[PDB]
């Protein structure tokens, strides 16, 4: 029987748990044995005892690690469990080197396997592993809900003998998966709701669900002639939004910038900015990040850790990620890791201690 | 012949509305009125002076504000350093809640002021447009709902994905008067499972409209023995929600408690409480005021001036409320009060110093 080991989770303001009480008892169920950090799951809202009643064994950090060939995490271990990890183990988790480098350099030096879950390739097989999606699917729901709390208006059209209030104007700004939930949850709420992206299969996307394509002159490289034109076009579409939510990002780079001062300086007093890039340096030029800033009315919000903000269900979600990857680690409840399998071969980092990423290298 | 109406920027703690917006400064011009705006009056609501002057109101010091003006639109009652200021015959025309506001309302009488409390306006068919207390809760009903989601660590609509399939948020609102009904359709909206309590077969209908479910208790005054098999049922309800909205408030007097010790011990780590009649006590035992507290898991809100969240829509509904009732206060232009209208006989509170309403009589001794 192979054993699965669950930590509470340290980085500032992280609030999730790599597996959940309803996963950790299928995993029980099937043959594996759990061991469950004292309190990880407290983040998540999830007791030790529903461990417990799970069938997991909650113990002391310390004693985590002890005959665990399986670690599950949400961010990367910190050293204290790297340090305590057997020789063969497998840690799987995000470990994303660009803001944990010493961390990668500490197992690395410390010789583990590890699978990183932003690595899971974008196959159709993998869908039900993909943790940057369900993660993504998180932060697009939360960047609207932060939307109407922050706007000064009403989402949706309202009629009363007071008379007639008009739904609010929001653009989604990059439609991948965090931008096409911002599009449903601001469509739900009943706002007129508008997508930007240079993609002509992500604005389909965007109209299936009710939204409004952007569609600038040149049509889904340009000229720096051409980009005068694009970017006057979007500047005057953008004038007219009272939310604007921006999603756009690019792995281990500065966050393009999509709204610049001579957009931000035409938008009215009241209007939002949810910029969900404001970890890479933000959409927009005003973004500070982890900070609420308003100039000029216009309110600019930097959100850092939102699926902590939804510690529940991302946690939930991230666990059926993990549990679903786990058919191809684990087999009648034994340790037995299909390294021939694409999907493991692609998102391994590191087996028995040699890295086998590129970049990361 | 013509009357100038005064609006003043507000200066209560969190108080972020306006009496009046541009829009409806223009209509008060247009129909022959003057309008004088305190500088920065509108900046709360994202008013900068100039969209005051362009509607064609004088922008003034606050100083210089009541000179000339019958007519003061407020939203909070007017700061001693207003009431001073007063010319005599001249109407305030604002929300005043006297309980709260008692040295206020003192300094209006001794000023001998005529004062229309916004919240006296007369729930009649007449007065719908009128209605600030109606306009405001359905403010704090959306608010409500969306600060609910923004609080609850789970989603609230039904998702399926290739990770598996989340039910629904369940969501329970009490009290279902104008706030409540918001909170139910914003709640809807959203995607939750929503229920809703109301001791009012009509409050459920209205409910069952917006496709919320009524919580239907075993108890179609009551006695001892029947409130405590009430009680029991309404606790097992509660205790399956993941969000409890609450929004039942009596006038001038503490609100009643929805949630007891009782009901907040059998709700599940990482559920809801948003009490929206903190202002006065609290619908739920945990609620402190002003601020967002958790004990064994739960999450308890007790907002305070959600409407100046809202700043620029609670601030167009409200003026248009005033807007509204200024037909019986302003004639072709001029000042030209209804006396006789049951509208303001009603919603009067004082006039040249006279209290008329009686709760603020007992007050005032």
């Not at 305590?84 to 995000?94: K, R, S, T």
């Not at 944990?100 to 590890?114: D, G, I, M, S, Y």
């Not at 940057?132 to 059209?157: D, E, K, N, W």
């Not at 890039?277 to 009315?297: D, H, I, Q």
Request: with cysteine.
């Amino acid at each position: 029987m192979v054993t699965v080991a669950v930590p509470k989770e340290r980085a500032p303001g992280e609030r999730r748990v790599a597996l959940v009480p309803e996963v950790v008892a299928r995993l029980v169920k099937g043959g594996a044995r759990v061991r469950v950090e004292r309190g990880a799951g407290e983040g998540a809202y999830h007791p030790d005892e529903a461990y417990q009643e799970a069938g997991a064994e909650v113990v002391e950090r310390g004693e985590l690690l002890k005959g665990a060939h399986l670690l599950f995490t949400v961010q990367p271990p910190p050293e204290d469990l790297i340090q305590a990890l057997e020789p063969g183990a497998i840690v799987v988790g995000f470990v994303q080197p660009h803001k944990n480098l010493e961390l990668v350099r500490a197992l690395q030096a410390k010789k583990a396997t590890v699978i990183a879950m932003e690595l899971i390739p974008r196959i159709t097989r993998a869908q039900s592993m993909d943790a940057l999606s369900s993660q993504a699917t998180v932060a697009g729901y939360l960047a609207a809900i932060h939307a109407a709390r922050l706007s000064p208006r009403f989402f949706p059209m309202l009629t009363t003998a007071a008379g007639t209030i008009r739904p609010a104007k929001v653009m989604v700004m990059g439609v991948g998966v965090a931008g096409l939930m911002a599009i449903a949850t601001a469509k739900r709420l009943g706002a007129q709701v508008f997508a930007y992206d240079v993609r002509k299969a992500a604005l389909e996307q965007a109209l299936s669900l009710g939204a409004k394509p952007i569609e600038l002159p040149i049509s889904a490289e340009l000229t720096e002639e051409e980009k005068r034109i694009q970017h006057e076009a979007l500047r005057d579409h953008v004038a007219g939004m009272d939310v604007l939510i921006t999603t756009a990002q690019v792995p281990g780079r500065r966050a393009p910038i999509l709204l610049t001062e001579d957009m931000v300086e035409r938008l009215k007093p009241g209007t939002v900015v949810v910029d969900l890039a404001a970890e890479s340096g933000g959409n927009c030029v005003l973004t500070k990040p982890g900070e609420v800033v308003e100039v000029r009315g216009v309110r600019v919000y930097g959100p850092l850790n939102l699926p902590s903000e939804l510690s529940v269900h991302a946690s939930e979600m991230y666990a059926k990620n993990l549990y679903n990857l786990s058919s191809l680690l684990i087999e009648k409840g034994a340790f037995a890791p299909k390294w021939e399998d694409e999907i493991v071969r692609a998102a391994l980092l590191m087996k028995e201690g040699e890295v086998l990423h590129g970049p990361t290298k």
